[PDB]
Design a protein around this ligand. Structure first.
Ligand code: CL
Ligand code: CL
Ligand code: CL
Lengths: 288, 261
């Protein structure tokens, strides 16, 4: 009776194309959502003198969400990212305003056994409707705590990235606002875990509402765009990370980065205390 | 500016909005985690309320310019609570051109019933009516509300993209300010919030009409201090000031409110 229904026969199941459309208001709102301000007007304005709007590449999680595919596997929440991971890959810049035809898919289902975890992997692909050309990909890895033993394949946990044994090449601090979740939720995730202290505590057990995991991911994304992409959105190709611990709005997010190989880096995001790691196993591909 | 245009009207326009819009507006005018009725829709035991100043967004008088704010004025009057999501049939009028001074009026009705929901009156500076009278005594209330340095970047997402408020280049090299300025309608909203708390009991519906004059500019990050006097039952007058660093700078003046208790 306490078991989660997980279809081990659903790997490969896919959703029909769904059109995601947005205007510049949305991409601007998202940018402010992940903490962009007066300091980077390319992300927070469209009509400033000598500055074309750029779109953060982590916006792929909103216009190309892999989420729809979860309904093929079971009825669990596709967006509960704790202990899970999120990856994005871009093949073109996302325009300030546009449309994508998004299809999703159950990429993988892993059964670690009764009283161990289920792992569900959802993959999103977004293409320009006219040309059919591939714009963005997303990968959402969900950990369903203790829900194994449903008749699935054991599988293989992917290799964690190698973190060089030295000091980080760069530490980018990004503050967050006490009210940040209230703006970030207007990019679509209205879950009251992030906005209602009643709910956050009475159902979820936290002293206060937690910041959206994807907001944290967007903040780390801004730090990576600055440090590795030269402040050029388009120069970040892929970003992946694992969500290890929750963040509270108002906490400062330190993204520690290591350049490993031309066009590649690894990272973590933490909150200075011993530091709490909140994003781990970060991996980035970028154009020099 | 043909002075022949008085009494001219635009054909009706449908203004439509969802909860995202009214929640965004409230955050635009500085509401936060301590104002869950205005900034959330699904918080336990709290129905979303819409700040009455949202009339300036859903009942815009500016349709009438084609037929023709600092230093200008804005008034609103509401006959019903604005709903979190909804729509209005809006019609705008050139109320008066003075000879440069242009007074535009908007009226928004419920499309199904044809019933009047909101009125707005927008005075643009390019008979001057009676200033309210302020009583010679210390205010009944002073309500201080901060703004964030990014306040204008949020507020502009309720429609007004004027680079005056967002682009440092435009503001300093063409418009004559030291840095971008906060939308006057934003300051008005912040004063709106002050009024709702002090005179409305936190119930935004309780504030029926607000009118004020924009006298000096505000910059994002400044604390706006609304000074309020209860005059006659169900009525009050106010100003909104930024505390000097010096004499306090008055940014909204001639403020008059009608509310219900
Ligand atoms: Cl910034
Ligand atoms: Cl939304
Ligand atoms: Cl807008």
């Amino acid at each position: 009776p306490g078991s989660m229904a997980i279809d081990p026969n659903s790997i490969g199941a896919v959703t029909e194309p769904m059109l995601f459309e947005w205007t510049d208001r949305d991409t601007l709102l998202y940018a402010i959502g992940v903490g962009a301000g007066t300091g980077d007007l390319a992300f927070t304005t469209e009509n400033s003198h000598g500055i074309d709007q750029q779109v953060l590449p982590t916006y792929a999680v909103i216009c190309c969400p892999a989420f729809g595919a979860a309904a093929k596997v079971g009825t669990f929440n596709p967006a509960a990212l704790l202990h899970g991971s999120q990856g994005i890959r871009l093949h073109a810049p996302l325009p300030a305003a546009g449309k994508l035809s998004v299809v999703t898919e159950v990429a993988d289902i892993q059964d670690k056994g009764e009283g161990k975890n289920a792992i569900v992997v959802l993959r999103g692909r977004g293409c320009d409707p006219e040309s059919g050309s591939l714009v963005a990909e997303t990968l959402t890895t969900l950990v369903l705590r203790g829900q194994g033993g449903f008749g699935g394949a054991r599988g293989e946990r992917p290799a964690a990235p190698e973190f060089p044994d030295r000091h980080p090449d760069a530490r980018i601090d990004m503050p967050t606002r006490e009210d940040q979740a209230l703006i970030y939720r207007l990019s679509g995730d209205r879950n009251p875990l992030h906005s209602d202290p009643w709910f956050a505590t009475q159902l979820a057990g936290f002293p206060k509402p937690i910041l959206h995991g994807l907001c944290t991911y967007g903040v780390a994304g801004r730090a990576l765009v600055a440090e590795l992409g030269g402040g050029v959105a388009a120069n970040i190709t892929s970003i992946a990370a694992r969500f290890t611990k929750p963040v509270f709005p108002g906490e400062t997010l330190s993204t520690v980065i290591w350049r490993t190989e031309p066009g590649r880096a690894v990272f973590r995001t933490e909150v200075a205390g011993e530091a709490r790691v909140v994003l781990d196993d970060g991996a980035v591909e970028y154009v020099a």
